[PDB]
Structures are given as structure tokens and as C-alpha cells.
Amino acid sequence: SDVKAEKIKNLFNEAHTTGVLVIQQGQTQQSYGNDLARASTEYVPASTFDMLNALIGLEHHKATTTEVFKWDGKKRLFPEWEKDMTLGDAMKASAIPVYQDLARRIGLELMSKEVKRVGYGNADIGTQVDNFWVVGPLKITPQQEAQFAYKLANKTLPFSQKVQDEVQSMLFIEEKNGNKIYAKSGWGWDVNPQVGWLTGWVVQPQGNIVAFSLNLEMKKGIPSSVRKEITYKSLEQLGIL
């Protein structure tokens, strides 16, 4: 237990940054890493907000799981985004232009109501429906992200079963040794310091759900791939994977 925690602390150290990993099983959360105080600190959710954006958009018939969001031909931050996408394609790619489109369809009034009804982080979306989850004012703690993931995994969020099922399917990564992994990454590259997320859950073979939220400082020039590496190795050290 002490030896498991020390090994996870050293994963963050050897990436030359500070980070926390929150684990939820049942109604119990545990924090690991080299800055445990991050667990209860508010950060912009960045692309992790896509999960709630998708729930709200599908619940209120603003979009479907099959409709294609056409690329308008304008240069995007990543060349990989420069293509026609479904919501699920955009979830996997974290293609924010698709989720900005969806946010505008929802509109500020409905988005504010739904974020408050769910109780997501500080539940403050300010005045711009297509600019609140990357540079503020919306903030959320890793503890709150892990709790949100656990509820989505169990379909106990206050949305239809149908829409929670559809958003789970968008977040599915892989089955590994009988374990099903669901995850959304985030990188708030435009706040100082920068924030990196990986929020999701494991379904273990007998059906036990282990929710997690990794939150770390995205140092200048840090490999974006390190968020997934630290998460998977940490879950392995904990005997979750």
C-alpha cells in the first residue's frame, strides 16, 4: 500500500512534473502521486467537458450519434481534425470545433441550466457558450471528475439511459486482459500553468467499476503521450489493470 503509493509518486517525478491520480471504487476515493493537493484543486476541464457536452446535446435532441459534422476547410490546431466527423470521432480526437458547434446548438441558457442541474465543478459557464471549458470560468477538481466518471459508468447521471449508453460507447478505448477501458484526455494548453487530464473508468472482468482522474501540470514541451502512460502504469501498480 505504502510501496504502491511511492511507485506512483515516482512515475510523476520521472516525467519531470507534478500530478495526482484519483481512484474511486464504490463511494471511496484514494489519491496517489507527487502532489496530492491537486486532488481537491479546481482546474479548467478542457476537452474532458466533451463528455457532459455530448450528454446535454444528445439528451435535448441537438445532435445524433450518426450525423456528420462537415469540416468547413479552415485550418485547425491539429491536421488530424481537418475532416468530417461524428460526435464519437470528435470525442476520440478531442476535436473541439465539433464540440463548439454542439455547444452553440445547445445555447448558453440550456447549457448553464444543465451544468448546474448536474452540479459539474463550480458550475459557472459565464457568457460565451462556445468558450467556457478551456480558459474559464468553468473549473472542476480531479475528485469531481472521478465522481462524474463513476456516475457515467453506472449510468446514474440524471440523463436518459439511452444517452449515457451512447456517450459510454464514444469513450471506449480497448479491452485489455478482460478489462474494458473508457477514457477522455484533456489538455488546457491556454491557461498558466497548463493542465493535463485523463478521466475515465475500468470495467474489471466481474463488472466492478474503477473510476479514475489523472491531473498533472503540462510543463512546456512535455510529451502529450505521458498522460496515458502514467495512468496505465499507475492502474497496473494498483492491480486495477
Ligand SMILES: *C(=O)[C@@H]([C@@H]1NC(C(=O)O)=C(S[C@@H]2CN[C@H](CNS(N)(=O)=O)C2)[C@@H]1C)[C@@H](C)O
Ligand atoms: C482538449 O483538452 C484539447 C485537446 N485535447 C487533446 C488531448 O490529446 O487530450 C489535444 S492534443 C491532440 C489530440 N490528441 C493528440 C495527442 N494524442 S496523445 N496520445 O496524447 O499523444 C493531439 C487537444 C489540445 C482541446 C481544447 O484542444
